Design a protein around this ligand. Structure first.
Ligand SMILES: [Mg+2]
Ligand SMILES: [Mg+2]
Ligand SMILES: [Mg+2]
Ligand SMILES: [Mg+2]
Ligand SMILES: [Mg+2]
Ligand SMILES: [Mg+2]
Ligand SMILES: [Mg+2]
Ligand SMILES: [Mg+2]
Ligand SMILES: [Mg+2]
Ligand SMILES: [Mg+2]
Ligand SMILES: [Mg+2]
Ligand SMILES: [Mg+2]
Ligand SMILES: [Mg+2]
Ligand SMILES: [Mg+2]
Ligand SMILES: [Mg+2]
Ligand SMILES: [Mg+2]
Ligand SMILES: [Mg+2]
Ligand SMILES: [Mg+2]
Ligand SMILES: [Mg+2]
Lengths: 55, 152, 117
RNA sequence: CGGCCCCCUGGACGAAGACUGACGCUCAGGUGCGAAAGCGUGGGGAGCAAACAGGAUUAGAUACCCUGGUAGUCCACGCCGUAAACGAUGUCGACUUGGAGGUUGUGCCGGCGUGGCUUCCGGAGCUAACGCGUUAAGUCGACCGCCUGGGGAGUAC
RNA sequence: GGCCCCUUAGCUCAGUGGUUAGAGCAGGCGACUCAUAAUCGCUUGGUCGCUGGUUCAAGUCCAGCAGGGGCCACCA
């Protein structure tokens, strides 16, 4: 997320644009997902459980 | 309570000054329901302070009261099951009540011969930043300042 | 001594601590400060207030270099991800870029086992 | 069974036509393949981590948490032959109302059809019940494997 | 035998001849929790060994001993 501040704009707008770029980029989700190790069976079960609950 | 039903109860200003604040202070100083013995002490202390300072009779009390009123206190709040010390604001009525109570308790612990003289000394010191109520207010302020990171 | 007027501020955000360091554009550090050394230990060390204080106290030690402009690049998911740059704004520094530099394996190694708390 | 490219190689499906003429189904003994951990000989070793050492928590803590860390995890060849190896549902064939999707072929003019595989709901019927329901646990045929109260015991010789 | 390190709260470490005796370390009282454990706030405190020196000005500079300390040296 390279956020280049442009001419004649305050700090708040650039800050909000950077925050939205990071939120849409999904960096925090990846960093959380890589904190520990997940056995293949555990993830295969959790994905199906989430899919069943959603539908 | 669980219901939010309670309200405010009317109070009569004191006769010779028409001030609700003096009424509340007298109530705080009253014991055993013997009110008539309370305003006597209050009046004696007020007149002794008035003659000692020479500024006024009612403005000295107001200045001493203002010198002690705090603006922040510490309570407990939780987010994930662990208790904290969080600083919170104080409403004006609570400020006045705390100031009066601190002044009374500070006055009650001395070695003079009369209670009115103790009151005179304590109001004087509060007006000139030497009473123990000043120490109470400062300690509360600094404990609130120490636990500043937890302020949501 | 020396005059630069153009620097870059690197932020290391972590669940336990935050580190702020200002360096020249060729990666030659001029100063740094941490929330841990700023008088905060234990639980308070992991709050955005600590990151704000650390950022301001670090900027307080780069005034002699006469820095006029800064850009910020930040890594880590910690809670100091936000208040640090606002505290830098309150120091009057010019802000030109805000960038994310958090590392990401494209597979990589194997993470440690989950804690059974 | 998962980054990208090349070489060798097994199966499945659809479309019209031709050819052989029952050459079929199932299968006791027999043969082959078969997760991970483990074993033998020779390599390699970033990260992780049985055993092991220290720090805590605790009445105790040979643990759960933290700091370290060796076999092992990786490669070539050779053994081992076991899993909640599960759809807890043997293989082959025929017949029996519907609705909503997914993936991949083909014919005629976005429309009208026609095959293969696959996900969810549900009718008759079945079932002790839960439930299954054209991918049956529904109605029949051919062959194989297995069961006969709980422990002792999938143990002893 | 010769050079050289210093002597300070209940304890350990700091302290420039002027207008400092400095912090940490145990305890006491409060703060939070229904209440401990962990956290936070305020504090009970000092003979600069004895003595002397020059010096307006000395814990401060010099030491005499003593105490606790190294090396140099060693053919009654
Ligand atoms: Mg537990
Ligand atoms: Mg057989
Ligand atoms: Mg293996
Ligand atoms: Mg092995
Ligand atoms: Mg091996
Ligand atoms: Mg080996
Ligand atoms: Mg490890
Ligand atoms: Mg471990
Ligand atoms: Mg092993
Ligand atoms: Mg078996
Ligand atoms: Mg399996
Ligand atoms: Mg079985
Ligand atoms: Mg079978
Ligand atoms: Mg159904
Ligand atoms: Mg039976
Ligand atoms: Mg039996
Ligand atoms: Mg039996
Ligand atoms: Mg057996
Ligand atoms: Mg056996």
């Amino acid at each position: 997320p390279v956020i280049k501040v442009r001419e004649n704009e305050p700090f708040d707008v650039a800050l909000r644009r950077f925050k939205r770029s990071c939120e849409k980029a999904g960096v925090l989700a990846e960093v959380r997902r890589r904190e520990f190790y997940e056995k293949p069976t555990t993830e295969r079960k959790r994905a199906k459980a989430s899919a069943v609950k959603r539908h | 309570p669980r219901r939010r039903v309670i309200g405010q109860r009317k109070i009569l200003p004191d006769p010779k000054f028409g001030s609700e604040l003096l009424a509340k202070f007298v109530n705080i100083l009253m014991v055993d329901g013997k009110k008539s013995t309370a305003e006597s002490i209050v009046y004696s202390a007020l007149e002794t302070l008035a003659q000692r300072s020479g500024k006024s009779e009612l403005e000295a009390f107001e200045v001493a009261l203002e010198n002690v009123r705090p603006t922040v206190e510490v309570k407990s709040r939780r987010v994930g099951g662990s208790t904290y010390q969080v600083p919170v604001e104080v409403r004006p009525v609570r400020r006045n009540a705390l100031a009066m109570r601190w002044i009374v308790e500070a006055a009650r612990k001395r070695g003079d011969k009369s209670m009115a003289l103790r009151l005179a000394n304590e109001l004087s010191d509060a007006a000139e930043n030497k009473g123990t109520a000043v120490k109470k207010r400062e300690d509360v302020h600094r404990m609130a300042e120490a636990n500043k990171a937890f302020a949501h | 001594r020396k005059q630069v007027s153009d620097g870059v501020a690197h932020i290391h955000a972590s669940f336990n601590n935050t580190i702020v360091t200002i360096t020249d554009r060729q990666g030659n550090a001029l100063g740094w400060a941490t929330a841990g050394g700023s008088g905060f230990r234990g639980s308070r060390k992991s709050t955005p207030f600590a990151a704000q204080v650390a950022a301001e106290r670090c900027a307080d030690a780069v005034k002699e270099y006469g820095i006029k402009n800064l850009e910020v690049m930040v890594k880590g998911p910690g809670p100091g991800r936000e208040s640090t740059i606002r505290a830098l704004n309150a120091a009057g520094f010019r802000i030109t870029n805000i960038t994310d530099v958090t590392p990401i394996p494209h597979x990589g190694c194997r993470p440690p086992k989950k804690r059974r708390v």
